[PDB]
Design a protein around this ligand. Structure first.
Ligand code: MG
Ligand code: ZN
Ligand code: ZN
Lengths: 74, 99, 1166, 89
């Protein structure tokens, strides 16, 4: 009927509401996915040496601690 | 009411009274035909170009009226010049060809 | 020589689709932000709808940041925030753009009634929208797999087809899909395929759409437009000052609605860009794409989907399509119609002292109007040191400035105009006469042409500034140069009322009066007798007069005699110049004769003598009318003595017929007609009683007992002279007035037995009310109806102008007297006057040429034709003129405000439309709607049918709903059989031969037939004679010429039959076509020339087709015209009137016709 | 004043070309290049040109002729000035 209000309400109504268990399933999946990319990042030598070369600039007053790490675990 | 040169409308440059010095008389379609039945081209051109709608021609005329030279260097009426931008504001390319 | 690369003077114009890169050419920056102004400092926020960097400086020659404030610095782009310092005018010029994330459809090419994207792709509209809303997938460039190129798929089906065919198959959805379709489309290849299929299958359903589409495709290819451009990549933004935010009093702001729209398009667009880098789910970015699509649509043309509403205000915000659009179409020269400087207006008054060529002008009006001239003149002679001091002088109104104004006014015409301008006489030029007071004085003789009463009507004044306007006004628009109606050669300057009552009372005679019988040497001592009080104005007297006849060769003869006349006629003779005979003033001089006096004076002595003559008639009329002491008393209206008795006798008839209805001798309906009939007869009786009594009852004595002459009673003189009043209105004053009518249209059987001289009771007035209210309503409505008709008329003609000198065709129409049923409802002399003979006409014997081939027939020639008995003259008409794209002056006629043959370059179409339209107020099948039906060609409700072909006819087959008529030509082939419903009573004899165009039944006939079967001259004669019947029945004089030009414009188009150059059935210009087969008749193909058939298009339909699109964009639907033109890349060359007015240059007619000619030949040359 | 232009319309038939010719002449007088060819009554240039038309001493042919002559009258003066521009070589 055009009137994009209609073509949204009817387009979204197909997606079924999540069960309380289904949310944790997807969220668990999220954890897996990111950690995969985190581990994949951990496996790159240049990714390490780069971080090293960057912190050496931080102690040399060529950058600031806020522009590199947001903090570790803790 | 009588008006020589008064204020002008901003949106389209046209005679408009702002001082309560009234804007000039409105020249309509029927009056244009009346000029068309007569052979008067210059009266009609000056009517819808220099006397009203041309932001340039009006001043170039006034200076000539005091200088003693009766002429008109008409140019293009600002209404049509605005209409070009409205058409051109759409996906329509409108050009003035040749020479 | 090099053509040019800078500003010369353009000819034509071109229109086409805009490329994304082409749109980027205009854009001086991308508007990246919804911000308008900073909100505290009101300066434009950079990269926003209002931006100094992209568009222009806020104030003249000054940078925004303020670093470069000097007028010397100009091409400098400021280093802080780049703004090239230049006049603020450029903020009204420079455009912008916006780069859209996803493609977007242009609503004009999607939703136009013949959806352009739809029929370009040969795809339905609902499908395209279903694809645009992401509601389904469509195939593109299907390759060889399973699928059609344009086929539409659903979710599962697209998925299934992809699992089956991974590659070598492609499908998209949304705007990107449609753009992919259009880009992949190869128009040339599609053209070839479509040409073959056209030839193979014969069906109307198939080839109608087929031929329509093929035209579009080949047009679009040659256009230069590439289909992709219907999908917008880049969106232009309108210059800021054309949609301003400008402040008001009290610190409030006001702005155009476009901003609210433009702002939206940016935001959603920007949001979409954000939504791309965030990797949003499909369901969102799709919704965002739809929202962007909806927003752009609302910006371009609002109202074709949802009609979005502006902020805080219910009223839907006006979009760019609505800015161009309107009532009607383009306000840029629609009604109404742009404000104009150097003008004014006020209530108008008489000023009888004026010469016909001048007018009284209020002092203050002339001061404020000529202000620049006064300034310029004051320092030319040195009365003011400088322009400022001159201003201070006229602002101080120093006594010395008044004399300078008398100089600048003297030779400098002014234009005068009234409110309902109809024909060209609605504006006339006058010489200003400085007059104390705030009222405009207008020459009485002109009051007829303006239809201007003095009851408070206002008139407008315009100053003709340029020299050409002064000479145009003086030599064209001047009052004295139009003394004759352009509709008919009769003078429109005819004295009106007071003046004609003066001359009527002047030349009249009573039976016995002072000075009766004496004799005087000449008019001089005749006036001396009258003014001294010795002799009465009207007395029978012999006086020696010297009249003149120019009947020699260009030479005035003189002859003197003793004429039997009155004193008034003797005195009046002093005015009549030279060669007019005394016979013209020797009569009673009514309003009708007093007009033909001026007319003959014009057709004999020329222009100049008639002007001064006309003035004198007015002056002497007013003077002598004042002497006459005419008045109106209550005893001036004489009621018949027998009135009450007539009412009583008429009252017996109704009671007689009533007794017959009580006894059933007569039916109810028959009674009503009967009673109504006796009352009507009674009204006639009372009317023809008071008319005899009132007219002749002056009964007076000369030397004997009695005698009776025409009454000298005041009110009779008014009605007799032609000044004012008529037998109908007089009848309402004295005799009973009418039988009124109840609202449903019936007429009440108890008339108004009283009149205005007596009292009307409660009932009679209440019954009279309906006639009044319907009168006012009818006139006020018929006024509006008349105007609309003139519109259609000027739209269908307009550009028709006299172009060539002589087209040189013997062709023309046969002019005969109208000869209706009696003797001569209109003569031959009036029908042929001022026209040109088609071929030499014979005496009853021959080898004697009276009028030699083509000659303008003037008064002498028409009287020479009347001397002889000649009953028939063939006359050249504008409908048969061989000249293409105009009319040759030789075929038109002489008619103008001047008696000479029509000039080269005068625009006849406008004056034709105006001449027909102005009287339309006086009209009332029957009436003005009958006229409208004629010019619209409409086929009647219960038409007749004309024999398709000559030869013996008979009836065939049987009753299916049509009983077929079978025609059998003698020599030719039989096969014509027409299906005629047999339940319509026939006329045509089953056993007789009928010529093509005979009467096969009764009832009106469609003029399409008459054109087709009888021919062009037949149908044009039918229209002119029928339309002229309507007007002449109302007493309107309109020469047949104008009607003939309207007819020519109706038949402008024709439909080809044969072939060998162009397409078979195309409707096309007979100017173009005839010029094409005349060009084809030699060279080219030896003769391949194609046969056409003249067509009859109604005025409103024929006006639809106009080569210039700017003209069509005016009065038609703008959107459709612009689109339909924009696709084909149509190039408007101007060449017409309407278009040149819009663009504001010289009209290619009249004074301008010299220019355009000089320019037209320069074009397509070296 | 000039009440009717009829006499001028006789001299040049069209009556539109009359306005043009009278215009061209009226500027020759208004812009001071020339002087009237017939007694000026205080009549403005508009009417002076029309009087010049009525008396038949001014029309389009004459004006073009007069103008075409003045071209050579000026081309005679500058003859040395413009031939001195041989510096083009
Ligand atoms: Mg009124
Ligand atoms: Zn700056
Ligand atoms: Zn012709």
């Amino acid at each position: 009927t055009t009137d994009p209000v209609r073509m949204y309400m009817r387009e979204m109504g197909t997606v079924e509401l999540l069960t309380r268990e289904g949310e944790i399933d997807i969220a668990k999946r999220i954890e897996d996915g990111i950690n995969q990319v985190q581990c994949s990042v951990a496996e790159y030598p240049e990714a390490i040496t780069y971080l090293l070369e960057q912190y050496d600039r931080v102690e040399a007053e060529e950058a600031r601690l806020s522009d590199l790490i947001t903090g570790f675990v803790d | 009411h009588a008006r020589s040169t008064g204020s002008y409308s901003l949106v389209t440059q046209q005679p408009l009274g702002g001082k309560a010095q009234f804007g000039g008389q409105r020249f309509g379609e029927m009056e244009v035909w009346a000029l068309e039945a007569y052979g008067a081209a210059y009266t009609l051109q000056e009517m819808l170009t220099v006397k009203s709608d041309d932001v340039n021609g009006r001043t170039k005329m006034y200076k000539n009226i005091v200088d003693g030279n009766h002429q008109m260097e008409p140019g293009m009426p600002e209404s049509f010049n605005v209409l070009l931008k409205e058409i051109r504001s759409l996906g329509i390319n409108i050009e003035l060809e040749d020479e | 020589l090099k053509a040019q690369t800078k500003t010369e003077e353009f000819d034509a114009i071109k229109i086409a689709l805009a490329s994304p890169d082409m749109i980027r050419s205009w854009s001086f920056g991308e508007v990246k932000k919804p911000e308008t102004i900073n909100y505290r400092t009101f300066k434009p926020e950079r990269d926003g709808l209002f931006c100094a960097r992209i568009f222009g400086p806020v104030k003249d020659y000054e940078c925004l940041c303020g670093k470069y404030k000097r007028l010397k610095h100009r091409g400098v782009i400021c280093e802080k925030c780049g703004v090239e310092v230049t006049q603020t005018k450029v903020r009204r010029e420079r455009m912008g753009h916006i780069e859209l994330a996803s493609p977007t459809a242009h609503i004009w090419f999607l939703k136009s009634l013949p959806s352009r994207i739809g029929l370009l792709l040969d795809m339905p509209l609902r499908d395209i929208e279903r694809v645009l809303y992401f509601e389904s997938y469509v195939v593109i460039e299907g390759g060889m797999t399973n699928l059609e190129r344009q086929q539409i798929l659903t979710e599962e089906q697209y998925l299934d087809a992809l699992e089956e065919f991974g590659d070598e198959f492609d499908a998209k959805m949304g705007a990107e899909a449609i753009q992919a379709l259009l880009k992949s489309m190869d128009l040339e290849q599609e053209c070839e395929q479509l040409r073959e299929e056209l030839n193979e299958t014969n069906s109307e359903t198939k080839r109608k759409k087929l031929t329509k589409r093929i035209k579009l495709l080949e047009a679009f290819v040659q256009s230069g437009n590439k289909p992709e451009w219907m999908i917008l990549t880049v969106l232009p933004v309108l210059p800021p000052d054309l949609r301003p935010l400008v402040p008001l009093d009290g610190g409030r702001f006001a702005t155009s609605d476009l901003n609210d729209l433009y702002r939206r398009v940016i935001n959603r667009n920007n949001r979409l860009k954000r939504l791309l880098d965030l990797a949003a789910p499909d369901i969102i970015v799709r919704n965002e794409k739809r929202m962007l699509q909806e927003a752009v649509d609302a910006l371009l043309d609002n109202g074709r989907r949802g009609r979005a509403i502006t902020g805080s205000n219910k009223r839907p915000l006006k979009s760019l399509a609505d800015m161009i659009k309107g009532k009607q179409g383009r306000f840029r020269q629609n009604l109404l119609g742009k404000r104009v400087d150097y003008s004014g207006r006020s209530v108008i008054t008489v000023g009888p002292y004026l010469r016909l060529h001048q007018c009284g002008l209020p002092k203050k009006m002339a001061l404020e109007l000529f202000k620049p001239f006064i300034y310029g003149k004051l320092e030319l002679r040195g009365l003011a040191t400088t322009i400022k001091a001159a201003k201070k002088m006229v602002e101080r109104e120093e006594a010395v400035v008044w004399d300078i104004l008398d100089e600048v006014i003297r030779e400098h015409p002014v234009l005068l105009n009234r409110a309902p301008t109809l024909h060209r006489l609605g504006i006339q030029a006058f010489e200003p006469v400085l007059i104390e007071g705030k009222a405009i004085q207008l020459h009485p003789l002109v009051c007829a042409a303006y239809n201007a009463d003095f009851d408070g009507d206002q008139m407008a004044v315009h100053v003709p500034l340029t020299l050409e306007a002064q000479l145009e006004a003086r030599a064209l628009m001047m009052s004295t140069n139009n003394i004759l109606s352009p509709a008919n050669g009769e003078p429109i300057i005819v004295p009106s009322q007071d003046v004609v009552l003066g001359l009527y009372y002047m030349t009249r005679d009573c039976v016995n009066a002072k000075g009766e019988g004496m004799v005087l040497t000449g008019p001089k001592e005749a006036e001396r007798l009258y003014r001294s009080g010795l002799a009465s104005l009207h007395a029978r007297v012999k006086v020696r007069i010297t009249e003149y006849e120019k009947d020699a060769n260009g030479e005035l003869v003189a002859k003197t005699s003793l004429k039997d006349t009155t004193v008034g006629r003797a005195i009046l003779w002093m005015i009549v110049p030279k060669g007019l005979p005394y016979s013209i003033v020797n009569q009673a001089l009514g309003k009708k004769a007093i007009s033909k006096m001026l007319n003959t004076c014009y057709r004999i002595l020329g222009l100049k003598p008639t002007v001064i003559f006309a003035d004198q008639i007015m002056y002497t009329g007013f003077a002598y009318a004042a002497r006459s002491g005419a008045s109106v008393g209550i005893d001036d209206m004489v009621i018949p003595e027998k009135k009450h008795e007539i009412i009583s006798e008429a009252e017996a008839e109704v009671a007689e017929i009533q007794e017959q209805f009580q006894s059933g001798l007569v039916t109810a309906g028959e009674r009503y007609n009967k009673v109504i009939d006796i009352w009507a007869a009674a009204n006639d009786r009372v009317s023809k009683a008071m008319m005899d009594n009132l007219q002749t009852e002056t009964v007076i004595n000369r030397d004997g007992q009695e005698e009776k002459q025409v009454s000298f009673n005041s009110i009779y003189m008014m009605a007799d002279s032609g000044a004012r009043g008529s037998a109908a209105q007089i009848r309402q004053l004295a005799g009973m007035r009418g039988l009124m009518a109840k609202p449903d249209g019936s007429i009440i059987e108890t008339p108004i037995t009283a009149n205005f001289r007596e009292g009307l009771n409660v009932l009679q007035y209440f019954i009279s009310t309906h006639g009044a209210r319907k009168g006012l309503a009818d006139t006020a409505l018929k006024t509006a109806n008349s105007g609309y008709l003139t519109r259609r008329l000027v739209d269908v003609a307009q550009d028709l102008v006299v172009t060539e000198d002589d087209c040189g065709t013997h062709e023309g129409i046969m002019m005969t007297p109208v000869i209706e049923g009696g003797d001569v409802k209109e003569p031959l002399r009036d029908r042929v006057l001022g026209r040109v003979t088609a071929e030499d006409v014979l005496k009853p014997g021959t080898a004697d040429i009276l009028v030699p081939r083509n000659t303008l027939l003037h008064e002498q020639w028409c009287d020479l034709l009347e001397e002889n008995s000649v009953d028939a003259v063939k006359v050249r008409s504008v409908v048969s003129c061989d000249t293409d794209f105009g009319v040759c002056a030789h075929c038109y006629g002489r008619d103008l405000a001047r008696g000479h043959i029509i000039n080269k370059g005068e625009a006849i179409g406008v004056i034709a439309a105006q001449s027909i339209g102005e009287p339309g107020t006086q009209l009332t099948t029957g009436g003005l709607p009958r006229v409208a039906d004629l010019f619209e060609a409409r086929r009647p409700k219960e038409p007749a049918i004309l024999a398709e072909i000559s030869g013996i006819v008979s009836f065939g087959k049987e009753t299916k709903g049509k009983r077929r008529l079978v025609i059998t030509p003698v020599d030719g082939s039989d096969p014509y059989e027409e299906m005629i419903p047999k339940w319509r009573q026939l006329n045509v004899f089953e056993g007789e031969r009928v010529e093509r165009g005979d009467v096969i039944s009764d009832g009106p006939e469609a003029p399409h037939d008459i054109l087709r079967l009888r021919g062009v001259h037949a149908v044009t004669r039918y229209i002119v004679n029928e339309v002229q019947d309507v007007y002449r029945l109302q007493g309107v004089k309109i020469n047949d010429k104008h009607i003939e030009v309207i007819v020519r414009q109706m038949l402008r188009k024709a439909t080809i039959v044969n072939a060998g150059s162009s397409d078979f059935l195309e409707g096309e210009q007979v100017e173009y076509s005839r010029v094409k087969i005349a060009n084809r008749e030699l060279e080219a193909n030896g003769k391949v020339g194609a046969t056409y058939s003249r067509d009859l298009l109604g005025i409103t339909k024929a006006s639809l087709a106009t080569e210039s699109f700017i003209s069509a964009a005016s009065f038609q639907e703008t959107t459709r015209v612009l689109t339909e033109a924009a696709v084909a890349g149509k190039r408007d060359e101007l060449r017409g009137l309407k278009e040149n007015v819009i663009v504001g240059r010289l009209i290619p007619a009249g004074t301008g016709y010299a220019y355009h000619q000089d320019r037209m030949r320069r074009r397509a040359a070296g | 004043a000039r009440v009717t232009v009829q006499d001028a319309v006789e001299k040049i038939g069209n009556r539109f070309d009359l306005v043009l010719v009278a215009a061209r002449r009226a500027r020759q007088m208004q812009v001071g290049g020339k002087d009237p060819l017939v007694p000026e009554e205080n009549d403005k240039t508009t009417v002076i040109a029309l009087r010049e038309i009525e008396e038949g001493l001014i029309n389009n042919q004459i004006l073009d002729v007069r103008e075409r002559q003045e071209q050579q009258e000026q081309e005679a003066a500058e003859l040395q000035a413009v031939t001195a521009i041989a510096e083009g070589r």
